[PDB]
Design a protein around this ligand. Structure first.
Ligand SMILES: [Zn+2]
Length: 667
RNA sequence: UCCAUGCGCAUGACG
RNA sequence: CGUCAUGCGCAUGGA
């Protein structure tokens, strides 16, 4: 409930109008200052006795929880109403009531936006920006094209212009709230010049309709006292491959596949995908099946260039073991093909000796063990530990690996995000909290993490941040995590990877240059530029809405037939399908049901083809074992258009399918 | 607390 | 515009 001196001056303009931005580094505790702005605004509104609301917005739920528990309540526990609002907190009360109540709100973004849309539709109780007297944001540097919450500012922008027009038109003018923006260093997006960066910043500011940035320069001394920045550091340090590449070449010869590129990169992957579409556009075999296999192989390569090939053997053991299980489940109610037999036998004839090759070291892994061991010695104990990388699979893999070799012990644990993707077992927010807490105790010495740890997770006191094969903001936040107590950054990758840390330093210089330029600017010219950017953004939104509205026009019941994509085989019609939840599609009418096969290895079985292809899940809804499917695995056959099409999702086409009627299923 | 799914978004790399 | 990897949020349904 007190102001630092450097916080004082920067907060100063916001206290009277001054919709502004703030950027300060980690550790400066910009929540306290924000709270002071809140309390001062509220006290002002009590002095005028008017509606004082704050609608604080974030990108993630965790920060809302943190600030509710620890920042907003303990300083406004006494006076005012507070509530921490999230998509996950099943809350009995609805949003516009906690607008009707709850002078202070902490919230995640799209709650608000959804409520505004319910307004614009008029569906459920609505809300508008007129119910407010202030807005505060965290992480404004996400404010850009089609951001989660940036859309709302465009409405604030749209109505704003109306106000000015109304002042010209009739001159009644509705109020609009003050806007505060907080962030770390905003960074910069896709620049090589100061002008590009400056245009970015002006874009941000007029997307926030701000007035200035108001960074700290006077009281830099106490800041640098609180803020100790660690040392910018760079620390940099067979036949199985060809054994497999020969197989790949044999497979091209088997398939007449001309790569027009090398093995072990994205271009070969993309060519494989395009060929797989075309052979899906042709309904042939040995042409798309092998595109998929070769996709798997190139994945195996690009891990082999970075990972112990034992993990590639794991990958392919998983794959082909599933393949054998698929073909056996097909045979259970039935035989192979020359294609499948060729590929499988080509694999299995080598599989054992290839696993033998896997057990032969002759690699960045050695450099990694060296980099790990050296820090354990210098610390001699009580060494915190962080690792970054790209993927999820890498983390499980390396954790399993490090469990096996040495350890002197630093028990380390993996970490990933949450998303339902990658064909992996994700983690859970609870589990993330558990892990970071154990690290907070230091019981877990080393963390293996993707780019979650850099983002917004409370970590500190650490020293040995690294990079095994990985923008300026990620860099500065990872530097913020490791403190200036014998802490050293490390980067390890085959080698422009140094280029990127260098670029981050370069952008760190450039952003300060642009900040200094814009701050020292005419208020007139500044306002003119920001108005132009606001008009540009608004017209851009109108064009996007025009294109989207013009997009979907057909909305047909049944114009198609869905087919197997390995075998150009009829599977379903357009009218035989039905819908549940207005989300999922399904095919009853057991004429269909005579076709498929079912499998389940470990809560819902999976539906697979007579060719062997995997098509869906035994979705159990309302007591019906609804065989749901995924359009990703299916191909389109219009009666009208000969060309085949494939979408990866239902909403690509506009043509609608009906909602299911269980009264049909009256037995 | 766990699980399945849909939708939207940003970021990095690649064409 | 297309691909991949990563991350985020929201909405459903179930235990
Ligand atoms: Zn089939």
């Amino acid at each position: 409930l007190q102001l630092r001196p450097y916080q004082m001056e920067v907060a100063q303009p916001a206290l009277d109008g001054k919709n502004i931005i703030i950027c300060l580094p980690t550790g400066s505790g910009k929540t306290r200052v924000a709270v002071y702005i809140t309390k001062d605004h509220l006290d002002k509104k009590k002095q005028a006795s008017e509606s004082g609301k704050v609608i604080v917005l974030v990108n993630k739920v965790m920060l809302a929880e943190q600030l509710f528990r620890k920042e907003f309540n303990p300083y406004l526990k006494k006076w005012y109403r507070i509530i921490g609002l999230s998509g996950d907190t099943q809350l009995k009360i609805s949003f516009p009531e906690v607008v009707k109540s709850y002078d202070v709100i902490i919230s995640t973004a799209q709650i608000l936006e959804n409520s505004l849309l319910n307004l614009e539709s008029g569906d459920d109780d609505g809300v508008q920006l007129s119910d407010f007297s202030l807005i505060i944001i965290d992480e404004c540097h996400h404010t850009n094209k089609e951001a989660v919450y940036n859309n709302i500012m465009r409405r604030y922008l749209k109505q704003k212009l109306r106000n000015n027009d109304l002042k010209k038109q009739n001159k009644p003018a509705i109020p609009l709230p003050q806007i505060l923006g907080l962030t770390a260093s905003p960074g910069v997006g896709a620049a090589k010049k100061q002008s590009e960066a400056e245009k970015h910043i002006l874009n941000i500011c007029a997307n926030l309709d701000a007035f200035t940035i108001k960074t700290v320069k006077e009281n830099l001394g106490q800041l640098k006292h609180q803020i100790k920045e660690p040392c910018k550091k760079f620390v940099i340090a067979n036949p199985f491959k060809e054994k497999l590449l020969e197989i790949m070449a044999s497979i091209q010869t088997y398939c007449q596949k001309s790569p027009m590129s090398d093995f072990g990169t994205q271009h070969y992957e993309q060519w494989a995908i395009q060929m797989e579409k075309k052979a899906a556009k042709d309904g042939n075999r040995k042409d798309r099946v092998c595109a998929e296999h070769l996709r798997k192989y190139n994945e195996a390569l690009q891990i082999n260039d970075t990972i112990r090939m034992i993990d590639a053997y794991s990958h392919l053991e998983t794959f082909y073991t599933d393949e054998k299980e698929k073909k056996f489940a097909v045979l259970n109610d039935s035989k192979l093909d020359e294609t499948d037999e060729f590929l499988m036998n080509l694999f299995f004839d080598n599989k054992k000796m290839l696993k033998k090759l896997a057990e032969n070291p002759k690699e960045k892994l050695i450099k990694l063990r060296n980099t790990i061991l050296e820090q354990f010695t210098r610390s001699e104990e009580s060494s915190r530990g962080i690792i970054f990388t790209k993927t999820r699979q890498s983390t499980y893999a390396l954790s399993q690996w490090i469990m096996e070799n040495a350890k002197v012990g630093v028990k380390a644990h993996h970490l990933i995000g949450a998303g339902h993707s990658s064909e992996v077992k994700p983690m859970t927010q609870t589990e993330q909290k558990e892990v970071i807490s154990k690290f907070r105790t230091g019981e877990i010495n080393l963390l293996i993490a993707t780019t979650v740890a850099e983002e917004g997770l409370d970590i500190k006191e650490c020293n040995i941040v690294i990079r095994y094969g990985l923008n300026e903001i990620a860099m500065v936040q990872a530097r913020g995590r490791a403190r200036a107590d014998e802490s050293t950054y490390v980067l390890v990758t085959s080698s422009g990877v140094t280029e990127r840390e260098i670029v981050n330093d370069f952008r760190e210089k450039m952003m300060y240059k642009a900040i200094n330029r814009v701050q020292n600017m005419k208020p007139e010219e500044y306002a003119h530029k920001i108005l132009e950017l606001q008009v540009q953004s608004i017209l851009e939104k109108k064009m996007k809405v025009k294109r989207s509205i013009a997009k979907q026009y057909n909305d047909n019941p049944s114009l198609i037939t869905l087919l197997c994509k390995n075998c150009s085989m009829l599977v379903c019609s357009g009218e035989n399908i039905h819908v549940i939840e207005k989300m999922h599609h399904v095919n009853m009418t057991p004429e269909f049901k005579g076709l498929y096969i079912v499998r389940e290895n470990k809560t819902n079985g999976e539906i697979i083809c007579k060719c062997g292809q995997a098509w869906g899940t035994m979705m159990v809804h309302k007591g019906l074992d609804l065989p749901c499917l995924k359009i990703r695995n299916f191909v389109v056959n219009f009666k009208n258009n000969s060309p085949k099409k494939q979408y990866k999702k239902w909403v690509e086409l506009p043509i609608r399918f009906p909602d299911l009627d269980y009264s049909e299923y009256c037995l």
